[PDB]
Symmetry: D3
Subunit: 323 residues, 6 copies
């Protein structure tokens, strides 16, 4: 069969941060405000609560409250199912379906049996089964000590028709593996870019349908610009292919913070630099950038903004592909 | 100064499994029964709730109930502080001190900022600070994407005098590193063996004071025998050095299950093979050994038991060092 | 079901060398003589034509002639299907069944699509299908740029019930993987030792049913002695476990030539040192040990023989387990 | 001495595929037609039968028939000597000289003694000696488990003056090694690009004289364009250096299929997409791209063609350097 | 505090070669001439005697004579403290301060205790203490079997306020580590580029203040051009960012000789190609490029010069940023 | 030809430490006393000045004075040629021949061109040429960033007949490589054990003629005992093969200090523990074991001594093979 790809996995999709109130509990009003703003800027959906959202630091109830709030605001939500155990992940998925979220981000099993593929298969089945009506994407990362390859992916999809996507945070070779062996069938399966540094490669070299973004919370217009240029390049455009690469290269240092353990520290600090004070505090009192880290990101943020202010005036694909 | 090592980190110490009731909730009565039995067999203390105890699958309340039950039974308890976040780990530590546990097993930060050493330092400080009166051991493993080396260990101990030990699950070279650079000072610091395959190396080559054991839940007398022989070898005994190595080698396959992701599946199945039916079920309904895995452990369990039944009759150190 | 393991994959089984006539064509009369001798010495079967037999240097017709000759002599033969292409491998298998060989050694695809698992699956199916009545073992080695894991093995066996074994030339961890995940089911599947250095580990730690041997062509009685001791150790015998390891250790250097590219040069030279002049020449005129290599093997052969002459007089398991 | 480089190793040189007749035997008429077409398009020579030509799947007689047919058509032929054994490789070389091929591609020993450098030296000598009048290039690849370095190359060339080139399929560092240490002497030695992804690096950074191409069978004009631009860049041209890199980058995904095990599956499928139906079947009945692989290459082929149709209209070096 | 960076570690700074007289003793007159010339060309300082200067081949007295000569000529000198032992390194540092050199390049301990971090800490302290009034940069390289990380760097700087810089010869990830964690504080610390291939990355992505250059001895105007363009790119300039990368890419092969063991052979030969005959001989009579190496560098030197002659005429940032 | 191995490279040979006077200059009287003592204990020769002797910390004159003193005392001396440059190494070699040392230890080039094999070949030639009448051994270690393999070794020996040995400090596989490919010819070439942990493997598995020892300075009788047992095992003795391995295993921790950067700190401290106070100070004022390192070696030294005191009373090979 030839099947339409799931619309919820198309376009540019921020994985939202959870802002803190002054008492270091979640500020759900601020979460919804930012979600609405980002959709207004041109994002197609949001992911909540992912690693950008500090999921391990929040209770399941808090995450579910945030999901509810975002959905009730009319924002298309892909729910993150990251969890300490099967029962928790399944609860996230069941709640997503109950409240009318639009998609599911299936995160592998951690802490108990993480490297066991047999465990991962059962865990994915349990999560998919809990939200059968929601399109689902599996996250694949070497962080888990195992890879979901084509065999496992297609065995899951045979029993779980909601499994329609594959989100790669790993390197370009892993994204290439997915494009060649999983996501280029006729059957409605979507590759999603899952790390900020792989946008051009994903869209142009790998046939990606959409990008889940960290840095796009901070620089939405610039990240949408890059995604648009990269999609135009994927149509064969000559100018856009050149401009996309220039923009990705200039964004590379800021995007690279998404690859490391301090991504929430860096991206919340950049939110603060753009004037959003509610991103000042972290849930853990001692989590903070070092003095050098703060200086480095400030320098690099100023550099990118200065370069973009002039580059973004250029004629041709640069104008055509703005958000 | 020359300081006595902490007695709680001496001897042979099972990291207890949590048995399931038929509804897959914890059977605390059975947990206490086994803890009492193992102390009776010659174990010096127990660890609860560690990875052997399925900590990620239990609520914090359940773990704390188990700790309380064990302490109220008069069992010396080292509390596992494994957690999804700082607040949870600190709560485990605070509860340990409140109820009169005898020691603390400090597990590093996971899932959020795991590889960041700055994060680990603050996390360890928070945990140690929460139970200042309890001797504490830090667990060190490559699983965490970072190592606690001498610099960090001594900076922590300077501010947290309860930090008196260092539990290595990693390879023999990592245990050697600890012995050479951390645990061989005069100052009351203890190296603990933290994987079942490193007992002889730990006691004889590395000066270990005690062993935290997985397989010792199943084969307590045989593991105490190995530890005793290895301690006698550490005094310079010729016979015990030879016999310890023979026994470790024979135990090696069964002990090696402690190194992998399926350790709880293997060790609960061995408990069942020895007649303890309460170890039949797992908290997750689908977690089970495969047919081949079950056959392999059954074969190897029979082999070891047959060999030990005859070897354990030999004269000399083999008799002297029995539990 | 519980099924008997295939008898053809039990015991000690030399992978025969092909001796050269003076014109460097195969000496089939000598091949049959040695095969008969080795069975007489206590070997259970032979493998022909494997890498020990110089398969790439012989035509398919020559290999098939040798197989025919061995079978007509009443020797139980496991046929090697190593080949440059599918059609060749399938021809070897079909001939094996036609002439009444007793088993099949399934070697993976080489030179064309070697690392492609999809290719390997089809290739194995083609070979197994060509000799449905012959018990078959798949050879697994990192040399091929891929591993046959449990999933592939069981998918093949579901469609090809003749697939009943798994021959590992790789390291002890790979043999352990096979024992834990493939060969310890109740269903009649056999692990075969497939490198000379892994005999004790295979029988005792991995449940192996038999060994395919290179060095056993040269030292049949000594290799059968080691296999017998190792099998007795697998029953739980204390003495045999100690003696097996002593004998393996003494054999280790000579056995290690089986791991390298020059195995046929080393083992033919050892045949010559024992008085079998027909092993002097190689099919390629320039293939020869260097002066240092020749000196090294001569020294090590003398050393082992001297040690064994005295060690093999010891009482107990050493006498009980002789061929 | 200063010596002219061998003309046969200059320019752009497809390693031809062998098309199948409907019965999966070679279609030699079609082979010659394509060879003639590609020379007409601007290729300087062809390689037959290399890995692109499915050498392991064909008999020696079939390969030699194809070589004869190509030579009799007046096509300059470099003969591939890939073989299962020395006698076969030497036969290919002797036949090449007999029939008037123009060059020799010397492929290392496989399957027997592959990693032994002593074996490789003798094997190369045997092949070179069999066609003394034909200029010869040695193929160097990590696939063989050994590298031909300067010492071996110059020892061979001292005794075999026909050895005048060095074809690198390995990475850019290996090509750099060859340029720095082997091929930049005054003495008539040529570096040949031997993988489709290394064209610019080879010509500009490494002094290459020519390229043996896989993708150039499918996209001859575009590959000649890239080679021409890269050669102009090697003269110091500013525009060509920029344009060469743009074209290589756009060709990179299609070229990357040359690096993997499925190169013949991908490139025959692309031939089919361009209308050459005789490239439909493979010699092995079950060798075929998967559905995803087919979708991936189709998408990427369309993308490249669309981009090139517009990019190739640009003024300057892009026009000057067309085939 | 916010502190000005040390001016001596700004700009472009050649690590000078020591030319030989015909008797293979140092030609100090020629050393001073070249130092003066390079300052005249636009270099800000020189380093002497570093690895470019053949420090291990010269006596301490010879190095100190060269330093004296350069300082007396009015050239700003950063003194290299590379040494076989602590006493030697400290003597270099003490002499630097005595004669009025402007900075210190602190090279780690070698040959005795090289991998011991405790040894490195004491060694750095000894060197820094010997020249307290001179700004100092520590060289960091994997060549030493250890890395100076932030902890060690800041512990040294707390006791040695002259430690104000960090020179990275390692890869881009190591330079990134330094920028993120060491050199981006407000406190007057400078990252210096310490390998010729990392200029753009250092200035733009890592906030570098200056570059110590090998190839800049040979191509001073072109290296200053690259540094200027890269510094303009670090201000946010669009044109300069593009042009810097074009120039770095064209310089990449010549710059890459700085990464290898033969850097002095390559760069002295290039000096000879530009007409400086005093760079003909080496201190060791047999040290010389091979014929292929000489051909390779000659080809690549001609290529770069031809490309630059035309590229350097382009309007815009290329003109603005010339030396 | 069949040639006698060089007697100077036979037996057990300490690489002497250089004791310090209270002013941290060399105590040559003490050096000679210890050298004489060790010969009296049963050592066959000494090496001076090697890394054990702190060569990088001493002047060439000091080393040569020590060599002279040892030779004038009638001790057979193998001179270490470790050096910062060719001229220094050659001076050591020339002096060795002048004063009547009995052998040469050829150490590779460091600090300048270390990884360049062309450089190493010329450097070895220069050193060998400077002492043509002295038997010479080349040291081979991965520390140098290159390996001397058979090709280089035999090319050197063809022009330098004094090159008669090969000293391996690397792992067992590297020693095996040497035995198989270099040192097992008939031609008078000797493999020397060059790290304390490889004694049994060297003599029994690799045909070594002698051992250069670090720990043997401290425990001469025990190291000679191990060497004697290992040599008896190399004759085929059953008892000695078992006892050698027991003794090596017990010595393993103390021997392992020879593998690391702190070998001189550990072995001088052990000399002090045995009552030799002249081994208290190091040439560098701050070089000292840490508190933990000191505790570790003290514990392990006591353990070994206690075990040996009883083990060394056993009948059989243990008595026969004492010094």
């Amino acid at each position: 069969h030839h099947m339409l790809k799931a619309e919820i996995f198309s376009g540019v999709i921020p994985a939202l941060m959870t802002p803190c109130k002054p008492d270091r509990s979640p500020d759900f009003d601020a979460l919804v405000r930012k979600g609405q703003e980002l959709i207004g800027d041109g994002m197609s959906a949001v992911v909540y609560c992912g690693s950008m959202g500090d999921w391990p630091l929040l209770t399941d109830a808090q995450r579910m409250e945030g999901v509810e709030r975002l959905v009730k605001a009319g924002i298309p939500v892909i729910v993150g199912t990251g969890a300490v155990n099967t029962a928790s992940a399944v609860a996230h998925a069941a709640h997503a379906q109950k409240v009318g979220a639009k998609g599911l981000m299936v995160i592998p099993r951690v802490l108990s049996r993480g490297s066991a593929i047999a465990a991962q298969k059962a865990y994915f089945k349990a999560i998919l089964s809990a939200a059968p009506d929601l399109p689902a994407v599996i996250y694949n990362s070497p962080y888990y000590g195992f890879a979901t390859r084509a065999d496992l992916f297609f065995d899951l999809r045979a029993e779980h028709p909601n499994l329609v996507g594959f989100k790669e945070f790993g390197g370009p070779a892993d994204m290439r593996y997915a494009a060649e062996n999983i996501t280029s069938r006729d059957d409605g399966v979507s590759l999603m870019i899952g790390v900020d540094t792989a946008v051009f490669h994903g869209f142009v070299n790998c046939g990606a349908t959409g990008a889940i973004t960290g840095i796009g919370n901070v620089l939405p217009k610039e990240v949408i610009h890059l995604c648009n240029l990269s999609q135009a390049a994927a149509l064969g455009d000559v100018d856009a292919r050149q401009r996309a690469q220039e923009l990705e290269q200039a964004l590379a240092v800021l995007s690279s913070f998404d690859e490391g353990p301090d991504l929430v520290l860096y991206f919340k600090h950049m939110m603060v630099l753009k004037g959003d004070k509610e991103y000042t505090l972290h849930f853990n009192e001692t989590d903070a950038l070092s003095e050098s880290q703060r200086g480095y990101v400030e320098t690099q943020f100023r550099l990118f903004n200065t370069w973009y202010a002039e580059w973004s005036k250029l004629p041709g694909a640069v104008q055509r592909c703005k958000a």
